[PDB]
Every structure is written in structure tokens, then in C-alpha cells.
């Protein structure tokens, strides 16, 4: 064959359905898989169709129409843990199994009880740096890389305290400019109205 | 099932490597293949059954050899940055058939013309913001490894003395400190978020530790600094 | 015209000095295209026109391929002469392929052999396999348990073969789609039979018939096999035995590749 | 077990015209298991350059050949096909019958 196509990433809500789109051009075909690919860790097989029509495994469904020549691989009632990539293979007529570059799911939690705030962590001993933390955002805030090249802002990371059943978002911000706060850290993303910077 | 080995390299460029791959489910099929950044995988060597190989689509640079059915060692003769990649070894019960493929682990391998600037992480922890704890009740600690370089590096977080999980999260990716280098140095996040309750035991232990793979006995070291050698780097907090 | 792809395997257990465990080949209709087997190792053409309009990669590749079906097909054998009990050389044999009809309707077919007797054969429309006793009861039901190798085997018939055939077709159309109209005779042989002689045809199949009075068709006809000349024509013959004390007049009828041919005797 | 012993056929490749070059064929089908001996005989000994196609795949499982050479037909010149086999006890000869 010669190509493989799926969108390069998705984002979609916890408790929604996305729908993950995979063509191909090849020459022959003699069926098409689907492998999940959490980030750090090996491809593990979801699916594979070769005939018309849809196919159920759990929350996910995987589509073929050999004429128009695509599939889909269909999540139900999404998850944090389906956060991960999805790749798509076809055999061609050699049998040579051909891979698309893979599509990124991103899931975005749902933040039942928002309470945005920035918070100062306490300064180590053992380092000249000081450290901001922007948690407990809802889902549909983004954090943008800073401008000043000598602070460093980290992506919103999803954690979960399994014990009392409780997610929230956050982003780390650190520097060792003298002439850095945490009232300041994030002054390039745009954050919600009510986030609740503690006083020094 | 299907073991790989060794899963992360830090090689310079003309050292002969060779990456280890067995699987004990009697699997005919074998292959390598690299995974790189905007690619799909890409099939280097494979084999369909022992006392047969076949050039992959990407094969320069590389040789294999299926005496026997277990074992599918992917040799580089003689290494070059662009084999800096993931590589994983797969198996798969028949070639060409609708059995699927059964991966491997992955071998991180990083292929450096230089060994210069190969760097350990900095590791930092930052204890609670004490208005985090009044007003939600939680308490966040925060990890921070900075400064290595390659980024071949796994952080966890140890409480009294075990590995957890739960209320952790981090980054998926390490940030270049400074995005436009092309040998920028690296930095990862973690988040370790407790109860206030447990926080607030005197005896309560937190460590964050950072492995790094670096270089190893046989590797020349010039720098004035310390030779990064493979290690674990750790900070630690107390509750209050 | 009608045409067909099919490949067939042959292995052989406990094989004497010499002679291949192994053999797989190709055929267009009546025309080798493709061989390989455990002493060469290598997939090759048995047709100049397929040499000529197929990569080296695909030879390669299915080269590859055939290495680990020969692996298999070895396995297999084994694992059938266990369970018949069967000791000494025994054979075990595939055949895979499609015919695109001249209407342009297709069949499908896939089918083992154990000892030269069918063993199992694949449904493509139902989806399973047919087992002849109880050693391929068996097996069949390990095949059926894993349902997405039957629906590849229905695409692949279906879809793919019908594709390489067409595909083949095009390479060989030269030799494939032409046509030597047959030469015929009719020869007299204290009994006196007649014979129907057709010989210099290409594509083999040819029909011939002996008819008495042109509105009956005769019985108790002898009929000869098409054979190869050894030139890429075919020859044939059919055969009356004539009844002194009846009356009735006989005729030759051949048909070859669209046209009736009629020799009155 | 079923062993199938083989159907053999002499014949030429164009009508025989006693003095005119030809091709003396050996047809040798419907056999099984494969393995199989072909000879073409002249007055009565075996000919030395004899060819043959590759061993050849039927539908019903059983396997055929084609042994052939050139030669010019005599009036005085007999030929023939020796074939071996499993199912044969010792060798057949088939005449070719003009
Ligand atoms: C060259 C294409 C040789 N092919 C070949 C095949 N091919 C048909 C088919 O792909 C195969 O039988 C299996 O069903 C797997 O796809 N079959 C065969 O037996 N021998 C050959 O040499």
C-alpha cells in the first residue's frame, strides 16, 4: 500500500463517545487492525475487521467499508485511563501490515466542584527555586507555555485520589528569578476569573 | 511472553550494539520495528518463522538472525544518531495472518555523536502550600527533576518506604528547558496530592526519586563535572 | 473467457532421498506461474510473463512468506498423522483460489487433503468448515473458534484473489486471452468405429460430441482427454461404435471458444 | 490409504507423417502419491534427451506430467512410455499406437 491516514490527536469529555477515524490507500487489502498505546508503553491489540460492518469488544466498537476505504474504532462512556494513542495497521496485498502515525485521545475530566487557585509551595532547602501551582481548574481552562524563558510551566496533569474518589487538574510554574511570584506565574494563560490567589 | 532487553541506551555513535528480544509462546513470527515522533511504526527486520529473515522497509544500519525460534536479536554494527528511536520487538503466533501482534516493552536508545552534555536531573520536592491545606483541605507536593539531558528518566514517589500511585500524577512528556536548542536540557513535573490528615503525621515519609540511564563504565569521560553514569536521584520531605 | 487463479501445496512426511518435503505452485487456468519448494527456498516464475511484470520485492516477500508456510504446512502434518496413528510417508495438501466467469459472477474456493483424499473443505458463504471424519472434525473446530481467519478467508477469495487474477490475466493476455481454432477430422477404425479428431487448440477447454440423425445426442460415447501437444495447443477425440444393421447417420460436433463446427459423416 | 496409479498416454504432438520431424509426448496423469519414474523407449531402450514439464497439480489431488523429444517417425521404428510407480509392481510400457 501507500497510506495511512488518522487525525494526529482528539480531545473529548469523560462520559462521551469519540469517534477515531482511520483511511487507507492501499494496494489490496487484507484487513484492518486497531492498537491502544498508552505514552511509555508498548501497543497492545484492540481490533480487527476485514469485512463489512461493526464489530463490538466492550466500550469500543471498530467499523469497516472496504469501498470507501476507512474504519472507525468507536469509545463509549469514555475515561481517564482510555487517555492514550490509537494506531491504526492495514495488510496489504503482501501482507504487509502498514501503520498510521496514530491518533493522541486526549480526555478531558469532569471537575465536579471547581475551586481554581494558585497556590506558593514552600521553598527546599536545597533549592534556589521557587514553585507556583495552579490546581482545581475545570477542564476547559488550557495552560499556555510561559514568555519569559527563565520560568518553566508545565502541562495540566489529571490526578486522582482514588480514596475519596476525587480528580483535579494542575500545572506547575517554577523559576529562580528574584523577580518572580506566584501571583504572576501564570499571567499568560488564561485562567478563571474567581482563581483564588492566597496572600503572602 | 515476549521479553526485551535493554529497555533504555545511551550509546555513542560507532559503539556496536544489540538489542535483545525473546518470547517463550512458540510465536513463528518475529519483528523490529522503530517508533519515531509523526511516524507510524516502521519495520526494520522480521523474520516468519526460525532460519528465516527479511529486510524491513528501514533495514540500513541494521542485522538480525533467527537461529531458533525464541530469540531475534536486532544488531547495529555500528551506531549513528538517527538511530536515536524507540525500538520494538513484536511477535506474532503466524505471519500474515489475523493473529495479532504481541509487543515488547520498547528500547529507548539515543545515539550521541558526543557525550558531552549528557546531564543527571536536579531533583527537588516542595512541600504544601499551608493556604492550599486551609482552604481545600488537601495537600500537594511537588516534584521537580530539571537539567538532564538525554531524557531518559522515570520518576515515582515513595511513601513510607513504598511506591505509590494513587494521587499522583506526572508529566506525560519532560519540557526542553529551552525549546529551540536542538541539545536542550530537560525537565519533568510530578504531583503527590495527600489528605491533610495524612500530611499532617510527623511520621509520614515522602520521597521522590528520579532514575536516570546515562553512561556506563566503558564510556570516556572528559568533563570536569561528575560522569553521568546511570543513577537514582532523590529529595525528601517530612509531614508536619 | 472463464479464468481462474488457484495455488496448491504439497507436503510430504518421511519424503525418499532428493525429493522436496515441500512443494507450492501457481497456475492460471491450465499455466504454471509460480513455484517454490523446501530445497530451492525461493519463490520463482514458471511463466516468462510473470518474470518480467513482477518486482523482485514481490518474489522476496513471498518468498518470505512460503519459508514460514513450509514451517507450518510441516507442523500440520505432523499433528494429522498423530492423531490418524499413521506411521510411514503420508501427504497433505492445499488448494486456495477464484474463477471470474465470463458473465462476471466469481467463485471461491479453499480445501486440504490428507493421502490425496479431500480432508477439509472451506464454505465462504456460510462461513465453515466441512470435515470428512473425525481427525478433521477436530481440526475444524480449532479453525472455526477463530472466526476473523474465515472472514479474511472470504475477503481474500472474495476480493483479492479475483484482483491478482485480473491483474495476471493482464501479464499473460498474450498468451492468456488468444485463440487457435482446432483442426478436425473425423477417422473410420470386423467392427468399425468413428473417430473425432480435434487437435492445434488453444484454450483447452473444447467440446466435442458424436450425433445421430443431427436431433439425438448419442450414448455410449468414448471420450478422449484433452492433451497437451507440448507447444501450448491442445488435442482431443471422441469415439462412436457404428451399428451395421441400424440406419442412422452420424456427425461430429466440436465447440471451441464460441464457434460450432459440424463434420458429417 | 488410497493410492491412484497412473493413466499414461503416447501420442505426437502433430498427426504423424512417416519421414517428417515430430514430437513424441508421454502424458502421465491422475497419479498419487508423486513420486514417479518416465521413460521413452526406441526399439526397445530408453532415449537419453528426454525432457519433461515440472511435476503438475490437479483439483482431485492427484498429480500429472509431460515427458516428450523429438524424433522422426519410421515405418520400421517402434516407441514407447515406461513409467514406474508405487501401485505398479514393475514397470508399464505403453506403445505408441499410430
Ligand atoms: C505468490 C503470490 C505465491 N502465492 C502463493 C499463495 N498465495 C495465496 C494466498 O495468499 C495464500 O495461499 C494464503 O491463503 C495466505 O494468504 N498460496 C500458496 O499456497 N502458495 C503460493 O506460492
Known amino acids: ?105 486526549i480526555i478531558k475530566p469532569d471537575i465536579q466542584n471547581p475551586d481554581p ?38 502541562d495540566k496533569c489529571v490526578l486522582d485520589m482514588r480514596s475519596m474518589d476525587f480528580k483535579s487538574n494542575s500545572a506547575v510554574a517554577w523559576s529562580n528569578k528574584s523577580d518572580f511570584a506566584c501571583a504572576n506565574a501564570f499571567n499568560n494563560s488564561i485562567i478563571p476569573e474567581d482563581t483564588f490567589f492566597p496572600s503572602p | 511472553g515476549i521479553t526485551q532487553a535493554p529497555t533504555s541506551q545511551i550509546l555513542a555513535a560507532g559503539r556496536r550494539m544489540t538489542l535483545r528480544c525473546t518470547q517463550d509462546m512458540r510465536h513463528n513470527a518475529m519483528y523490529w520495528y ?87 536531573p536536579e531533583v527537588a520536592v516542595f512541600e504544601p502550600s499551608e493556604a492550599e491545606i486551609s482552604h481545600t483541605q488537601k495537600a500537594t507536593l511537588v516534584c521537580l527533576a530539571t537539567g538532564f539531558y538525554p531524557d531518559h528518566v522515570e520518576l515515582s514517589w515513595w511513601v513510607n518506604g513504598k511506591e505509590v500511585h494513587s494521587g499522583v500524577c506526572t508529566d506525560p512528556q519532560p519540557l526542553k528547558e529551552q525549546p529551540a536548542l536542538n541539545d536542550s536540557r530537560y525537565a519533568l513535573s510530578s504531583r503527590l496530592r495527600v489528605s491533610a490528615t495524612f500530611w499532617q503525621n ?27 553514569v546511570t543513577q537514582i536521584v532523590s529529595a525528601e520531605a517530612w509531614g508536619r | ?121 472451506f464454505n465462504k458463504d456460510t462461513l465453515s468448515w466441512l470435515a470428512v471424519d473425525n481427525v478433521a472434525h477436530t481440526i475444524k473446530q480449532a479453525w472455526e473458534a477463530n472466526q476473523h481467519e474465515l472472514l479474511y478467508q472470504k475477503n481474500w477469495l472474495e476480493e483479492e484473489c479475483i484482483a491478482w487474477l485480473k491483474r495476471f490475466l493482464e501479464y499473460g493476455k498474450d498468451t492468456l486471452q488468444r485463440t487457435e481454432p482446432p ?16 487437435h492445434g487448440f488453444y484454450p483447452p477447454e473444447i467440446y466435442m460430441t458424436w450425433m445421430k440423425n443431427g436431433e439425438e445426442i448419442v450414448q455410449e460415447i468414448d471420450y478422449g482427454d484433452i492433451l497437451p501437444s507440448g507447444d501450448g495447443t491442445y488435442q482431443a477425440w471422441a469415439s462412436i461404435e457404428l451399428d451395421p444393421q441400424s440406419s442412422n447417420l452420424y456427425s461430429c460436433h466440436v465447440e471451441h471458444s464460441g464457434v460450432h463446427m459440424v463434420l458429417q459423416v | 490409504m488410497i493410492q491412484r496409479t497412473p493413466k499414461i498416454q503416447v501420442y505426437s504432438r502433430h498427426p504423424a507423417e512417416n519421414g517428417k520431424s515430430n514430437f513424441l509426448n508421454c502424458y502421465v496423469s491422475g497419479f498419487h502419491p508423486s513420486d514417479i519414474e518416465v521413460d521413452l523407449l526406441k526399439n526397445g531402450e530408453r532415449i537419453e534427451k528426454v525432457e519433461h514439464s515440472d511435476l503438475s497439480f490437479s483439483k482431485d489431488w492427484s498429480f500429472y506430467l509431460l515427458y516428450y523429444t523429438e524424433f522422426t517417425p519410421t515405418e520400421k521404428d517402434e516407441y514407447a512410455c515406461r513409467v514406474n510407480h508405487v501401485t505398479l509392481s514393475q514397470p508399464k510400457i505403453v506403445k505408441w499406437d499410430r
Not at chain 1, 488518522?6 to 477515531?20: D, F, H, K, L, R
Not at chain 1, 514552600?122 to 476547559?140: E, G
Not at chain 2, 522480521?46 to 533467527?66: H, I, L, Q
Not at chain 3, 518435503?21 to 499455466?31: L, M, T
Request: negative net charge; charged residues 20%; contains cysteine.
Open chain 3, 183 to 198: 483442426l478436425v477430422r473425423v477417422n473410420r477404425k470386423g467392427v468399425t468405429a468413428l473417430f473425432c479428431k480435434a
Open chain 2, 34 to 120: 522503530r517508533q519515531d515522533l509523526g511516524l507510524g511504526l516502521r519495520l526494520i527486520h522480521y523474520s516468519n518463522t526460525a532460519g528465516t529473515t527479511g529486510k524491513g522497509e528501514v533495514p540500513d544500519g541494521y542485522s538480525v538472525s533467527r537461529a531458533n525460534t525464541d530469540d531475534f536479536p536486532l544488531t547495529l554494527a555500528s551506531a549513528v544518531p538517527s538511530q536515536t528511536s524507540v525500538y520494538f520487538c513484536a511477535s506474532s503466533e503466524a505471519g500474515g495472518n489475523t493473529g495479532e501482534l504481541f509487543f515488547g516493552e520498547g528500547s529507548r536508545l539515543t545515539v550521541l555523536e558526543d557525550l558531552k552534555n549528557v546531564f543527571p
Open chain 1, 117 to 154: 487557585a494558585v497556590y506558593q509551595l514552600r521553598d527546599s532547602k536545597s533549592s534556589d527555586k521557587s514553585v507556583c501551582l495552579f490546581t482545581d481548574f475545570d477542564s476547559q481552562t488550557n495552560v499556555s507555555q510561559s514568555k519569559d524563558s527563565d520560568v518553566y510551566i508545565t
Open chain 3, 1 to 121: 473467457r472463464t479464468h481462474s487463479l488457484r495455488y496448491f501445496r504439497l507436503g510430504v512426511s518421511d519424503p525418499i532421498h532428493g525429493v522436496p518435503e515441500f512443494i507450492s505452485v501457481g497456475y492460471v487456468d491450465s499455466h504454471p506461474i509460480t513455484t517454490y519448494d523446501s530445497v530451492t527456498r525461493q519463490k520463482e516464475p514458471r511463466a516468462p510473463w510473470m518474470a518480467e511484470n513482477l518486482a523482485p520485492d514481490h518474489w522476496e516477500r513471498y518468498t518470505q512468506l512460503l519459508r514460514g508456510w513450509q514451517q507450518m504446512f510441516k507442523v500440520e502434518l505432523k499433528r494429522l498423522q498423530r492423531h490418524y496413528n499413521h506411521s510411514g510417508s503420508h501427504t497433505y495438501q492445499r488448494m486456495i483460489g477464484c474463477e471470474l466467469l465470463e458473465d462476471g459472477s466469481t467463485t471461491g474456493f479453499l480445501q486440504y487433503a490428507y493421502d490425496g483424499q479431500d480432508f477439509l473443505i
Open chain 1, 1 to 105: 500500500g501507500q497510506n495511512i491516514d488518522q487525525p494526529t490527536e482528539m480531545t473529548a469529555t469523560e462520559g462521551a463517545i469519540v469517534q477515531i477515524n482511520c483511511t487507507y490507500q492501499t494496494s489490496g487489502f487484507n484487513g484492518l487492525f486497531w492498537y491502544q498505546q498508552h505514552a511509555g508503553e508498548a501497543p497492545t491489540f484492540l481490533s480487527y475487521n476485514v469485512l463489512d460492518g461493526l464489530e463490538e469488544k466492550g466500550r469500543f466498537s471498530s467499523f469497516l467499508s472496504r469501498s470507501k476505504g476507512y474504519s472507525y474504532l468507536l469509545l463509549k462512556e469514555l475515561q481517564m485511563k482510555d487517555s492514550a494513542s490509537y494506531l491504526c495497521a492495514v495488510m496489504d496485498s503482501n501482507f504487509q501490515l502498514i501503520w498510521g502515525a496514530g491518533t493522541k485521545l
Open chain 2, 202 to 228: 510527623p511520621r509520614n515519609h515522602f520521597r521522590c526519586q528520579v532514575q536516570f540511564y546515562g553512561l556506563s563504565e566503558n564510556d570516556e569521560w572528559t568533563q570536569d563535572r561528575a560522569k553521568p
